[PDB]
Each structure stands twice: as C-alpha cells, then as structure tokens.
C-alpha cells in the first residue's frame, strides 16, 4: 500500500430505491417534476411552437416579391418585343472606359 485511500464504491442503481425512476434525480418528487418540466417545455413549447413559428415566419426574404417582379418584367419585356434578359447590368453610357 502507498496511501490511506477509500475503496472504489459500487455504482448505485436508481431503479433499486425507486422502480418508477425517470433517471433525473434520486428524490422521487424532484425526479418526477424534472421529467415533467423537461418534457413539457422542451417537446411541447420548443418543438411545436417554434416549428409553427418558423413555418409561418413572414416572407422577409422577398421570394414571392421577386417572383411577382419577375413576372411583371417578363410580361412587359415580351409584350414590347424587348429581350427578356439584358446584355449588361449597368449602362455603357454611364460607364467610361479608359482610353
């Protein structure tokens, strides 16, 4: 021997002292309420409410706005015979090349 050391204790089983244990705490009431709050808050509140909130988040990415603008521009372009997509993004009149 080299030290006055405690022996390694045997691991305790929560099911021995409480067959209805949820694995949260060794106190039955505290374990039950920990399980209840975890399940309620996490599953119900977070999952369901956050999922429906994200599903019905407003269209701030302007996907539908972009689609409507594209439809309007396509209609105007093909009604007047103009090309659907312009050749250049900017105006060559405003662009001054170095020469």
């Amino acid at each position: 021997i080299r030290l006055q050391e405690d022996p390694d204790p045997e691991d305790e089983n929560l099911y021995e002292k409480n067959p209805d244990s949820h694995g949260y705490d060794k106190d039955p009431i505290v374990d039950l309420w920990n399980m209840r709050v975890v399940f309620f808050f996490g599953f119900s509140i977070v999952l369901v409410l956050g999922s429906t909130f994200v599903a019905y988040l407003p269209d701030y990415r302007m996907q539908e706005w972009a689609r409507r603008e594209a439809e309007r521009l396509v209609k105007y372009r093909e009604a007047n015979g103009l090309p659907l997509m312009e050749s250049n993004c900017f105006d060559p009149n405003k662009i001054q090349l170095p020469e």
């Binding site: 689609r67 997509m85 250049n88 405003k94």
Partner: protein, 174 residues
Amino acid sequence: PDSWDKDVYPEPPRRTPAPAPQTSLPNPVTYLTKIFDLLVDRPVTLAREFIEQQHAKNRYYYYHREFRRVPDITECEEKDILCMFEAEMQWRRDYKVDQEIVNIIQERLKACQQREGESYRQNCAKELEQFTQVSKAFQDRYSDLGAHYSARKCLAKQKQRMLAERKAAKEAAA
C-alpha cells in the same frame, strides 16, 4: 383556378378528340369516371363552396411592395459608403429578380417538353431558343463572381468584357 397571367405562362390551346366508339362493350373508364364524380368531386366541391363562402364574409387585401430606383455603383463615388450601400442593395434585388426570370423560362421549357411528349424535339424549339438567350445573358452578367459577389465585382467584369469587345472590334475593323 386560373389566378395567373396567361401571357407570362403561355399554354397552347387544348384539342381533345371526341369519343367515337367502334364496339358495343361498355366503357369501364367512363363508368369509373361517373362513380368518381358522384363520390369525390361533388363532396369536395360542396366543401370548397362552404369554405369560400366563409372567406368572403371577411375579405382583406395585401399589397406588392414597390421599391424606388436609386443611383447605382457607376454613379457612386469611391469610398462613399452610403451610396455604395444603396447601390449594392438595388443590385442584389435586381439579381434576385433575374434569377426568378430564369426560373420562369425554365418552367416554360419543362412544361412545353412534357406537354409535347413524343414530338418535343421539334415542337418545343421556341422555348429552347428563349431559354438559350436568357441563359447566355444571365451567365454573361452574373458569371463566376464567387461567393462574395458584389455590384463592384459585377461592374469590373462588365468593364473587362467591354474592353475585350472594343479591342476585338478594333482589331477586326482596323
């Protein structure tokens, strides 16, 4: 429903041949269509009528947001952060609109191919040319600008392309 623009989403007129049977046997397809109309179509039509009656009780409207035009990066001075920001936002909105235009043309092409079916290689050649033109223009504009694309990078690409075109034209007619 047909709550969309027929000119934006073209569709050739539908020619359905008239039924001209040459046999005395009954038509199981016709009998099953009658059964389907009696059992499904009428109940769903009644349900939709009730729902649309409920919708018309309180009718409210939503609008399409209109964005004003602002000076672009060509008119923006160097190191002018406010004008650069406005031009960048305008350019990004234009980029998204162009992406949706390309999507519209691709939808046209897909629908035309499926509709024509066995004779698509000839019938839906008008959509193929429009898609080719739109795709070429879109590629020339928003070509490989990278993941950090910007109005300044697009302007630089356009200036380079314009210089190349001018040099080619000069060396051709010179």
